[PDB]
Nucleic acid binder design. Structure first.
Lengths: 271, 93, 46
RNA sequence: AGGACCGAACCGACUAAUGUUGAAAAAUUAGCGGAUGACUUGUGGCUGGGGGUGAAAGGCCAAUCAAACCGGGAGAUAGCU
RNA sequence: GCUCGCCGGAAGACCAAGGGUUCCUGUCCAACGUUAAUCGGGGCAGGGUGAGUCGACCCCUAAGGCGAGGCCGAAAGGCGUAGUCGAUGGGAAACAGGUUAAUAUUCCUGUACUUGGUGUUACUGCGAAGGGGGGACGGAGAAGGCUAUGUUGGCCGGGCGACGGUUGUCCCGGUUUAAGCGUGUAGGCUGGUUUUCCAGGCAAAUCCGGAAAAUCAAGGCUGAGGCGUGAUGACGAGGCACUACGGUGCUGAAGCAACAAAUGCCCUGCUUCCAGGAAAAGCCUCUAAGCAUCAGGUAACAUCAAAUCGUACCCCAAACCGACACAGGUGGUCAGGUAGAGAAUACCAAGGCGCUUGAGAGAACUCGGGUGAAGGAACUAGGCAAAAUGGUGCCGUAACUUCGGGAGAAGGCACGCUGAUAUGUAGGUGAGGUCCCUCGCGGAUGGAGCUGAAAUCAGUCGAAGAUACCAGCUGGCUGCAACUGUUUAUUAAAAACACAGCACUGUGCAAACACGAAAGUGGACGUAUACGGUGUGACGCCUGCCCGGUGCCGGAAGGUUAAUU
């Protein structure tokens, strides 16, 4: 549900929160957790390599099953859980041999639902098959890029892929960007859309809400001195430069893809 | 068992002071300057074999040397080790 | 007011101590220079 | 419930006076702002000089900053005093 | 020594860090001490720090560091695997009383507890670097049960008052007692127990996960505090006796109850919210290899061990950081009384101090304050400064508004004390008794004692009752920025920065981008509802025309065009 806050303080006036009442209220399933300390966007040289990362709430990592390899063994959805590490909700599922796994929660999935992976699986959401077994024109998500590697495409809340064609050992996919891509037919995908499609409709409302997510303030280049940024300087507000990154690369229209290795897999750029 | 060699080295002196005399006449404790690397076990065995008394317990502390001035020139005395050695009620060193 | 020197023995020894100096070629060159000069105290350690 | 309200600790530093060979190389006194948060603080760690870090003042990086400090090139050069 | 004054959420007490003998005693007064000094944190000499249980060391890991091989790099080196370090976090155990000039949870007295080594008898499946469980975790909020602790009464001892009164519903003091052991309470959580089977937990597992059957209705875990014991003790007001008048020596009554009450404890609970909340060991359990009437394990018993290092003293400061015996700076713990919402504030307690130059005088002028005729902003760049307002309850409150606000708008009334209602009320607490009892730290009635506001009515004192300290000035028009935040450490706090929101643009994952000769690493254990860059800056109504220039994007004929040949 998408609910609006009442303006009882200025930092609350604009808050729009997304309240899924189906999400588990207790702790996550402890065997599938790992520690995940924060980087502050610094690398192994201790240098900031991505700006605007720091602080925010401590988060435990949930081991999500992106591979879906237990093929032929049915699983029942135990519950839906909040995952701080991603936009999408997750589902704790119980396999008939007693194994529990986390999956990305697809649209429509609820507790009690039956899921199955592998060549034989039914064509219904939450089920994972090789795309050589999925009909052309199907909606899918969590799509593999190499057979066996685990899903890499359409994982964010509300996203999905359309299988637009099947030719030989390949399938032509439409991605959310609008790009058309060839992927090997042996690659697995899960039927349906990723759930939690109302994720995009939340409104943080205040600076502090961005700080809770580990996002530090962005300072505009035009607010800096020439020594700091190409945009820096000027008595009063001045610009008169072509817009560029802090490292001097044009930032309004200049394309930066250069991957000749993978050019063969693209059919049509996103436009 | 500790060699007699070692035990003949570990004890250096009786410590003479008013607290030492008080410990002797109030708690049957003898106060001894001992080697810095002497342990409670070694002190016990040495006192038991060389003063032929029977030892209840040894307590140890390290006295830190005092910084001093000989003719405006800075020196420091040595750290030494002190042992309170309790004797068993009827030994009378 | 809070002045620049805020003593901590652990931090002192970790940043300037004998073992910190011995850990790299440049620190060892510090100790070579100080020995050549005849310093009574090579490091903060003692 | 709240980057909600009033207000101590705690954090800060808007005004005035004093002080300016100071009690103090930035403070005192009377008032002043925040005070469950984008809060504050201890201990330890990491980022190193055309480099860091910067809710951006060219700010800060040991009372030093439009390029730290120490040593070396080095007795730089000085149509100037 | 007697009086006076000052602090008392500190200017008292106890630690950590940091310092290192400054601690205590004797002796000295050259220098040091902003004066003198017989004194000292000064000189000189001697003395003083006692641990199985406190801390370190130790076992365990975080960030991070180092890093065999390894990958990478002119060399130096960089990264990183296995590992191995690294607390600020997890992991065994002790309390009260007494004692020194100076140490004490360390010494002594009394009473405890923990881990391991050996050896007894008993029973017996033991064993990992592997599996599982556990350890093991956020924020906010609410309330109940308590205790620390306090007040009053009772009790016991002492007292009869320098000046009117004071045998009384009078005055002063004390009324303390631990860990541990026994009890398992208020309360919190979970349904047990057994048999059969199983694509799971790297292999096996009797363990865990899962599926099913039978059976049962209380089992298990956690848990403050109370009570009992510890304790026929210790402590104890005081009294007597020494005194080298410094402090000891000798002896010691009462040691109950009610009420109030934490921010501490139950509580790592409970309720709730989104921003979704370490690790690893100790510990429990499972088995593998192995051992197989053994070693190994589980209980009770004895016996041995528990080392080493720190321990003085300062520690919001004259001992630390500030060149100083410097109005500065410095994390944690403890938390009495009266008034008070309070850790504010005033005055006090315990405790600690009067800040290492004094003595006079009572000019100008300076500093910090008090009051002020009449006037009341005429001052001035500007009401700068000052004066003023200030509490609680209740009445009442505008434009505008995003319907929350604006608002404590504004403005106004009441307020002390005494008595009555009511010999102290409503309320809270709650004993004896009686009743029941699946039998107790029980439940129901019961209402003694204790505690106790507020209200009204009547009187009464003063000029004045929120009397002190404490404690909003208010309103109208308007620029700018939405707002809370941030900033020029040390002349700028703002209209500057940030911001939620908006838009453009890049980026298909070995992403773009960034650090890096490189290996790699961050982005991200993320995947276009994502991530980077840029500009704008909540919200409302909106955001027009221009592609000639410069840039970016696409184009692929023609011209011009590198090395090459």
């Amino acid at each position: 549900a998408v609910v609006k806050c009442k303006p009882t303080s200025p930092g609350r006036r604009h808050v729009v929160k997304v309240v899924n009442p189906e999400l588990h209220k207790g702790k996550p399933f402890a065997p599938l957790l790992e520690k995940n300390s924060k980087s502050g966007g610094r690398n192994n040289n201790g240098r900031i390599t991505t700006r605007h990362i720091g602080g925010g709430h401590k988060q435990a990592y949930r081991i999500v099953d992106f591979k879906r390899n237990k093929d032929g063994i049915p699983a029942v959805v135990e519950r839906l859980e909040y995952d701080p590490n991603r936009s999408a909700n997750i589902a704790l599922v119980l396999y008939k041999d007693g194994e529990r796994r986390y999956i990305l929660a697809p649209k429509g999935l609820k507790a009690g639902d039956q899921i199955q992976s592998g060549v034989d699986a039914a064509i219904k959401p939450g089920n994972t098959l090789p795309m050589r077994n999925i009909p052309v024109g199907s909606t899918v998500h969590n799509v593999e890029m190499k057979p066996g590697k685990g899903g890499q495409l359409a994982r964010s809340a509300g996203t999905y892929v359309q299988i637009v064609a099947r030719d030989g050992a390949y399938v032509t996919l439409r991605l959310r960007s609008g790009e058309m891509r060839k992927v090997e037919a042996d690659c697995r995908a899960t039927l349906g859309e990723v759930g939690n499609a109302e994720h995009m409709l939340r409104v943080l409302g205040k600076a502090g809400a961005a700080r809770w997510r580990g996002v530090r303030p962005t300072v505009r280049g035009t607010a800096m001195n020439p020594v700091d940024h190409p945009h820096g300087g000027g008595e009063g507000r001045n610009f008169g430069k072509h817009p560029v990154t802090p490292w001097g690369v044009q930032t309004k229209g200049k394309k930066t893809r250069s991957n000749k290795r993978t050019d063969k897999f693209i059919v049509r750029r996103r436009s | 068992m500790i060699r007699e060699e070692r035990l003949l080295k570990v004890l250096r002196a009786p410590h003479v002071s008013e607290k030492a005399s008080t410990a002797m006449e109030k708690s049957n404790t003898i106060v001894l300057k001992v080697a810095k690397d002497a342990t409670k076990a070694e002190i016990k065995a040495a006192v038991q074999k060389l003063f032929e008394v029977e030892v209840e317990v040894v307590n140890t502390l390290v006295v830190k040397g005092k910084v001093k001035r000989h003719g405006q020139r800075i020196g420091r005395r040595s750290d030494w080790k002190k042992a309170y050695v309790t004797l068993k009620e009827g030994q009378n060193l | 007011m809070k002045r620049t020197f805020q003593p901590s023995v652990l931090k002192r020894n970790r940043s300037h101590g004998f073992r910190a100096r011995m850990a790299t070629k440049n620190g060892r060159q510090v100790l070579a220079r100080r020995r050549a000069k005849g310093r009574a105290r090579l490091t903060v350690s003692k």
